[PDB]
Design a binder for this molecule. Sequence first.
Ligand code: HEM
Ligand SMILES: Cc1ccc(C(C)C)c(O)c1
Length: 137
Amino acid sequence: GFKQDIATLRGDLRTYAQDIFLAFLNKYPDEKRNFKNYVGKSDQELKSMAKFGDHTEKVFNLMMEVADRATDCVPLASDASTLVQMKQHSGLTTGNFEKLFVALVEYMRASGQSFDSQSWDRFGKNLVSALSSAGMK
Ligand code: HEM
Ligand SMILES: Cc1ccc(C(C)C)c(O)c1
């Protein structure tokens, strides 16, 4: 389930983070605009860019935290508060997040692995709910 899937991703977090976030940029090619540094670059090029690797790690380090802290795939409001409030998410909207989570769940469903994709889908949904309620557009 959800809790074991957090353990699984935390076991190879570097590589799960880059692959899922890459799955997101390729499914929604328009999302690369938030990351102009990432335009006209192949996945293998992106994974050799210092900020690509480090920022994607920091994203998933935090993602997993919020996941870890959730009850029944419902994140804390305080963690909703943090994401919305972050300076680096000034120009973001909940649709950005939904897409990250469509890809992630798609990624898990196409994996060979027994990820609890149902959980992550709720979790994605419930984070978007909670970003709305904390004031994300
Ligand atoms: C659960 C979801 C997410 C978490 C936990 C998260 C976390 C973070 C963190 C920790 C940073 C700062 C890292 C750093 O500057 O070193 C950051 C920056 C940023 N995030 Fe997010 N983020 C999330 C979702 C998103 C989504 C969906 C987008 C865009 C669609 C996005 C776009 C950005 C951008 C553009 C920055 C600043 C530029 C950059 O980091 O290279 N984030 N986020
Ligand atoms: C927050 C965040 C997420 C992902 C990336 C790419 C490396 C994929 C960033 O630069 C920043």
